Design a protein around this ligand. Structure first.
Ligand SMILES: C[C@]12CC[C@@H]3c4ccc(O)cc4CC[C@H]3[C@@H]1CC[C@@H]2O
Ligand SMILES: ClC1=C(Cl)[C@]2(Cl)[C@@H]3[C@@H](Cl)[C@@H]4O[C@@H]4[C@@H]3[C@@]1(Cl)C2(Cl)Cl
Length: 277
């Protein structure tokens, strides 16, 4: 129930309300998305693209199932086949994240230039945090309603996958068995990083972030006494630091792939600083 102040409990209520209003957990309104059709840069792009191999499944409302197994790298443009779809899913998630931020009072009250700077800085991280809540660790599958993204069983097993930092993050974060309140506090802490590029109100954003972190620390103290949740707050704060690193890494991968194979949606260009010229 509580153990927090009035301000902390209202802070959680507003974040949970924003999450409820802007997170389409069944992905019902993700429609009209593209599907894979029926010189030293490339070597790096090829290494970037095969770091995440997923099969894709569509369950029809009628009960039909479409299933897609991707191709192995044969030395050409077939490794780009899932990029338009993933760009459309990313764009759909980004829209939910932007709406999430905009209905938060602490975010509305910041200058619009800081809003844009914080969203540009954190949108990828909040997308990852939401994707973890639909991640099934036992089946290696992100269950997005009628869409499923299954990690391709590969030599090395579920331990070679954990070498990919994005996949280790999702498995490790899932192992913590966080509450909805803790996930949405992680989103706030990430969205309120005072040191994003181009932030002006460093002091205000830092004070807001510290309050979201203290609320999280206090929430864990009051509602998780079990020995398994010892240092849970510090584990969460270390995963947020890792997520920031994965954010920087995946931003470089994106810019390299985009350099030789353009695929970013207009909203992705806006968030990752691509002007169109
Ligand atoms: C995850 C990868 C880097 C990050 C890329 C990205 C990065 C941001 C984004 O909004 C969408 C996508 C889809 C393609 C992703 C890539 C597919 C393989 C590569 O590892
Ligand atoms: Cl890395 C990755 C891919 Cl690719 C998927 Cl399909 C999705 C794309 Cl649309 C966007 O990068 C985020 C997630 C995440 Cl984590 C999953 Cl696996 Cl859900």
């Amino acid at each position: 129930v509580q153990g927090l102040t009035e301000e902390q409990r209202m802070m959680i209520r507003e974040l949970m309300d924003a999450q409820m209003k802007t997170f389409d957990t069944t992905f019902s309104h993700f429609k009209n998305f593209r599907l894979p059709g029926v010189a030293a840069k490339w070597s790096q792009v090829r290494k970037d693209l095969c770091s995440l191999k997923v099969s894709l499944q569509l369950r029809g409302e009628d009960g039909s199932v479409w299933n897609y197994k991707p191709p192995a790298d044969s030395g050409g443009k077939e490794i780009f086949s899932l990029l338009p779809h993933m760009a459309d899913m990313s764009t759909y998630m980004f829209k939910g994240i932007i709406s999430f931020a905009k209905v938060i009072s602490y975010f509305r009250d910041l200058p619009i230039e800081d809003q844009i700077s914080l969203l540009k800085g954190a949108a990828f991280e909040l997308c990852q945090l939401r994707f973890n809540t639909v991640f099934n660790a036992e089946t290696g599958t992100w269950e997005c309603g009628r869409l499923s993204y299954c990690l391709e069983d590969t030599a090395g097993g579920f331990q070679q996958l954990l070498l990919e930092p994005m996949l280790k993050f999702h498995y490790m974060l899932k192992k913590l068995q966080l509450h909805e309140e803790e996930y949405v506090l992680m989103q706030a802490i990430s969205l309120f990083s005072p040191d994003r590029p181009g932030v002006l109100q460093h002091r205000v954003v830092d004070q807001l972030q510290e309050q979201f972190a203290i609320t999280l620390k206090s929430y864990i103290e009051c509602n998780r006494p079990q020995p398994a949740h010892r240092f849970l707050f510090l584990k969460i704060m270390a995963m947020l630091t890792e997520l920031r690193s994965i954010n920087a890494q995946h931003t470089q991968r994106l810019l390299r792939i985009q350099d030789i194979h353009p695929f970013a949606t207009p909203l992705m260009q806006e968030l990752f600083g691509i002007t169109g010229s």
